[PDB]
Amino acid sequence: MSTENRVIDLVVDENVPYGLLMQFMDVDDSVYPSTSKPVDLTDFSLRGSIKSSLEDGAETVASFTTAIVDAAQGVASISLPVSAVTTIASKASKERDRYNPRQRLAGYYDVIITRTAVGSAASSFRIMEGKVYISDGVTQ
Amino acid sequence: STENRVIDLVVDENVPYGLLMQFMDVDDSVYPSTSKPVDLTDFSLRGSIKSSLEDGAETVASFTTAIVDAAQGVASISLPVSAVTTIASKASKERDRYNPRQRLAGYYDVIITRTAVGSAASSFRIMEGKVYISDGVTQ
Amino acid sequence: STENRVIDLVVDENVPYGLLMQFMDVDDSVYPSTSKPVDLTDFSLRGSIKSSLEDGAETVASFTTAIVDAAQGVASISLPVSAVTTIASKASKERDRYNPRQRLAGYYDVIITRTAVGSAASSFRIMEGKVYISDGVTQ
Amino acid sequence: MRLPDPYTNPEYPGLGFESVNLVDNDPMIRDELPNGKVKEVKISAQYWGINISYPELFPDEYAFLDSRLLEYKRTGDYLDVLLPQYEAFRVRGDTKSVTIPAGQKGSQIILNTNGTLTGQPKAGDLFKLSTHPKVYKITNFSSSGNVWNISLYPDLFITTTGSEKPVFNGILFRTKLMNGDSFGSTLNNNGTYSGISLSLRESL
Amino acid sequence: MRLPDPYTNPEYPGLGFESVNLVDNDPMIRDELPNGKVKEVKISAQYWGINISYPELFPDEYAFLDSRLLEYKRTGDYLDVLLPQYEAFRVRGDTKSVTIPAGQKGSQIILNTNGTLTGQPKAGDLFKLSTHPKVYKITNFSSSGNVWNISLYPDLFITTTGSEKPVFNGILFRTKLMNGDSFGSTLNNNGTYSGISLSLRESL
Amino acid sequence: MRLPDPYTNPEYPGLGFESVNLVDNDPMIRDELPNGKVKEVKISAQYWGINISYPELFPDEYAFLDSRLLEYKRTGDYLDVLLPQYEAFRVRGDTKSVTIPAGQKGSQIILNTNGTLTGQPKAGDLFKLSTHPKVYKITNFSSSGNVWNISLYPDLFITTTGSEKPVFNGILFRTKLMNGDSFGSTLNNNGTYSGISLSLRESL
Amino acid sequence: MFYSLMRESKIVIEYDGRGYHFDALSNYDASTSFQEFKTLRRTIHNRTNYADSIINAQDPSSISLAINFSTTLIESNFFDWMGFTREGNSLFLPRNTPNIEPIMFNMYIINHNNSCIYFENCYVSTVDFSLDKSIPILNVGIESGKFSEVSTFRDGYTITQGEVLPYSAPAVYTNSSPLPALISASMSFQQQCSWREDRNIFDINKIYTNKRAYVNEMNASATLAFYYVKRLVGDKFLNLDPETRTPLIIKNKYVSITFPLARISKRLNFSDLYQVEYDVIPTADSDPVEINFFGERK
Amino acid sequence: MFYSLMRESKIVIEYDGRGYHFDALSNYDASTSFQEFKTLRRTIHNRTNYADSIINAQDPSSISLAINFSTTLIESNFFDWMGFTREGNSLFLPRNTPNIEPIMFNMYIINHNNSCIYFENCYVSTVDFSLDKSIPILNVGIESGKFSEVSTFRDGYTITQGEVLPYSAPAVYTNSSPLPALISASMSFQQQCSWREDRNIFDINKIYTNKRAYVNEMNASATLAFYYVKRLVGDKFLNLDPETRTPLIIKNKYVSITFPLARISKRLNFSDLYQVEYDVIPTADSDPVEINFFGERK
């Protein structure tokens, strides 16, 4: 669980604006089971990006247009428009997944949350990572 | 030291690193969960990272240590973003076929020490292992 | 039970070493074994670290015995950081199989002794094994 | 006195209930009318009954246990027990600054925490007044800010005098043994006392 | 008050009825003459007896069930029991425009449905009046136009006043929990409660 | 007279106690008032009941055991029974220089050891006076210097005359064999005797 | 049409909303079945020949996986899911079982053409591996409550097992004194749960699937096989007497199972070359059993 | 160090203070083990995971020897020790079991470097050999109560088995009329004793070893396999009817087991060539069963 915990995969659907809804919540388990409270997300900015490969020279195929829908309650949203989805689909590998032919590899992604504030606690964390896949479509 | 307690640190690229310890001695013979946070007053931990596990190795980075809470037992081992960038520059490029995000940077240790008047050197090693860099794309 | 005198010591490079022996006398006549500690009177411990068992082997270092809290039986064996450096200097360049940080530095054994407590020199070996240096990174 | 258990004596893990039976004993004048209606009148006091079963006890653990039980039989006092399934510490805080207004009888009770307690006692948990040794059982809970309205299965044996303090943790049943007259322990060739069990019964 | 079942509370699947036992209790004085003729005499009423069995119960399921049972024993209410096998919906419509002629004290209900009800009740189903809690079983049913001729096993416990309304669906047994004088449940060392049984009796 | 055990007679290993049963027999008159208060009354004495079970016995083992039992029944003596689990030697020394103040008729022995005894007795051990055959169990022990405060389960069956001497080790139960009215043992076709049980009672 | 080949499959375990695709899988075995209630109502009126069988429950599935050790140590999550407490890369056997119910997770067995079998309410009930002169492999055994066929699924693109760890000879120690003439060290860990069948009359005319279970016990065990070797006449260290408490460790270059205090029973076989067999279990008051997972360079 | 090879061993049986070294031993098998009392005290307070196991008894050992026939006939002592009465070189099955307890003896399994395993309180519980078209060999089965490791031992330098007897074809007779078409004559003799466990509370905290046993029964049995052969139509001598009493003898050039009166049950198998199988036991009032041991020249 060194890195296994903060990694999930996203599959953006072609010809559809992709929007992922996130809900931060401070869950307390060590002290006592079944205790969870939302994280006050004021001043907790988000930013993410997608690249084709992990090399030093990599192409920025897209970038999430993150937004904090609710300042309190720890609700945030990372989303990208239809043009970004089309760019990802065009700039994706032609090798199809065998177990799911509609999915093809697009690239890698990360999400960093920057809690810049007046208090000298301008920390940064990488809360997400993984691979980005494109699911082909025909309805156009 | 603790040869059986080796843990490999993972530092994210483009992100300042932070790791916090808790020195908290226990005695559960009287009753389970009898743990008292150790006073860390006049304790100063320090460490380093070197490329190879031998003499003459080139130092990669030194952790910016601190004592967050004295007498509460919460120490912190950390280093800023520029040091992480230096580690990423110095890290090897033998990427694994199935963990293409992690590269080996070097080996690390940190030593806690007592600098109390009326006492002597009490250096002791508490961490040991390797430093792995996780690649990043969002910069 | 039987005998377990053979235990291997892993000392850390660049860090002073100190071991704390809680001497004890367990007896299993009664089902809850008696926790009576031995009483440390007229007791001295001696231990040298010598590379290999062959005769004439050079003395790599020598343990420094400390006797504290004689009533409850505990005792301490230690050696300064300079002794640690002298040990690490003569250690072999081949590393242990299970840990790529340890290197065989020599052999050791500590010998308890009663000096005319009853007009008898009742000295017998306590423990034994191999001493392993663990290469550090901090210095 | 206190019945030994792994909480009081952790060095004896053999002590501790292998299975505990918490029975409800409310005598009632039940009458089955010829028209189909069942009429029952509660007159006799209710009392919790505790049936404790012990696992294989080694000779030293049984020596401690029967020493404590024989001290009970000798000095003649009551024997307190602490059921561990009801030891979920769901209410933090100190209850000295909690006032229970006087003149309250029946199942319902009203107590004012004055903004001191943290945690909500859910239904099914135990409850006990500071003065009287009776042990109740919360059946429903409803709070309006600081004031708490608790409904207890057995009606309050004594009317609150305005000084009784709530006890939401560490509740002990003031019980009496019911197996004392003929209490035998068998020793096996394996070296353990097998089938040790107690039939306790709350007194008053 | 409704007994918890996996209709209202499906989050506790252990609260389902592992096996129900609908007992027909109609005490009679039966005498057998030497001439081979057996003679019976009926005075007392007939009451439906329901016996519920339960599987091993987790702490939360037992907590909910015990809280409900203690609430029952506190308020002295009447447990309502729903049998799924008797919940086949045949008669549908409004039961307010149907009229029952008064003065019917036998073992047979004659009602004019006034064409407001669709379907027909089947023999062996459960039938109940809206003004009395006793539950009846339809032993025979003949329909001649809009007037229905429903035959019931228990003799009508009330004389119809003309305001009663037949109830065919959603019928509950207004039971009272027997064996509550000594009610308990043993908690095993694995955390599950075992040995829980509800002997209920229809206290109309 | 001593009951044959594999201490005195190890050549007959079948004479060992396969399972002992130390029964606490203290008859009391227990009455439960309707107000929930259980009340007890004690008049009769407490007697330790010992039940011995045996495995299959070879002809020589049974011959020895039967000869001893018939010698008992002939001379009308008292069988002495030794329990190995109660033979832990804690208190060692001379019990003749220790003094017990007279007039002690309660359930507690205060004795001045006069520094002649090493070690301390443990709770739950077996204790006995030198002038009476009744066997006591130590329920509590507090030592303040040389004077010991030993607490015993059975109330002192004698009033100390000042000449009694405490006995901690080598304690035997002066039992009398019950169920001797119909005492037998079946001999199987394979030559071994089976079905031998000794129900002994402490006849002080 | 589409046939389903075992070699063309992918097993993904769904826990906490993340897919753990367990690559480096040597072999897996699974089966699905249903429970029936078949009664024959032969009467004096009609001595019938046709039974009254209705399918009313899903028999719990027993899935067994054989997984090679890997450099990313995803396989230690099986110890993590089975109940062991975690500190760093070492797994402790807790003194007491933490919770009444086990840790439940879902599992997918993916195949080509959107074909899948969805096992739900699974728990890890057995994990055992033999440290021997062949490549170590841990056979895990999980039990499911409900199986289903689904079109879309969860596929662990990122969370996957790395390269298999190179072979390294096992060695068992007492403190630091090696035990000579090792043959095969087999370790076994279990979470002996039990299904709580709550099939009731409200499930009549419906298919019932087991959902909840409770832990009867957890344990750690090891069977050690040696050659009967003695160094002295009347030796004290190596003999057949039982050892009530002795510190033992079955060590490898990549894994080390530690018994702080062990109860050893010995068994001698007069075979072609005499072999002694140990039966190692932790004692009553022993400290938690350790299981370290070293990826590379310890 | 010193390994222990089965081929480099010597089995000496100690009876009456004399060592009977049983050479001409084809193969032997033995095992030693201990009995444990392992209970898990899971309580509502602490649902523990660590058992309470104590070793308190030695499981009785089951040693099996396969011994070739020899010219000095030391192997007949196994019949002698198992309970048969002796007259000359012939062993009788007594009408009644002589004593309640069997004949106890100790056994050593010697090996190089003063290594030994000492089985004590042994008794011969089974002896069976098959007279067939292969070299006859009698597999004896003894049960021990206590096993131990000793430094010095007893070695039978003089009392030893001679050269193995040459093969000779078996033949079964009725009086003096041969029975045709023999396949395999298997003889079985047993002393079905039982251990009398007397583990009591005085043995707590000690290892218990079985010491005394009693004889449930002795018996002599033989299973004869023939080919279904008939010489006449409706033959009377050779058929499938049971024979309540008939004198039988399974004879060889070096051994002859005699049943003065036998109870024969027949069983026909419709195999490739029809085979009948006998089940020969002595009758109720039959004279003692004979077992003659001819070394050479009868």
Residue numbers in the entry:
A (entry chain Q): 1 to 140
B (entry chain R), C (entry chain S): 2 to 140
D (entry chain Z), E (entry chain Y), F (entry chain a): 1 to 204
G (entry chain I), H (entry chain G): 1 to 298
Q: What did the publication describing this PDB structure actually write?
A:
In siphophage T5, the unique RBP is located at the extremity of a central fiber. FhuA, an outer membrane E. coli iron-ferrichrome transporter, is the bacterial receptor recognized by T5 (25). We present the structures of T5 tail tip, determined by cryo–electron microscopy before and after interaction with its E. coli receptor, FhuA, reconstituted into nanodisc. These structures bring out the important conformational changes undergone by T5 tail tip upon infection, which include bending of T5 central fiber on the side of the tail tip, tail anchoring to the membrane, tail tube opening, and formation of a transmembrane channel.
(C) Cryo-EM structure of T5 upper tail tip at 3.5-Å resolution. After two TTPpb6 trimeric rings, the tube continues with a p140 trimer and then a DTPpb9 hexamer. A BHPpb3 trimer closes the tube and forms the beginning of the central fiber that continues with a pb4 trimer. A long linker runs along the protein down to the tip of the cone, inserted between two neighboring BHPpb3 subunits and contributing to the stability of the closed tube. BHPpb3 C terminus forms the beginning of the central fiber with two fibronectin domains (FNIII), further stabilizing the closed tube and giving BHPpb3 the shape of a trophy cup. BHPpb3 results from a tail tube domain duplication/fusion, as TTPpb6. TMPpb2 density is very ill-defined along the tail tube, probably due to a poor interaction network between the predicted coiled-coil of TMPpb2* and the wall of the tube, except in the BHPpb3 cup. There, we could model TMPpb2C 35 C-terminal residues. Three TMPpb2C copies are coiled in a superhelix, burying hydrophobic residues in its center, interacting closely with BHPpb3 plug.
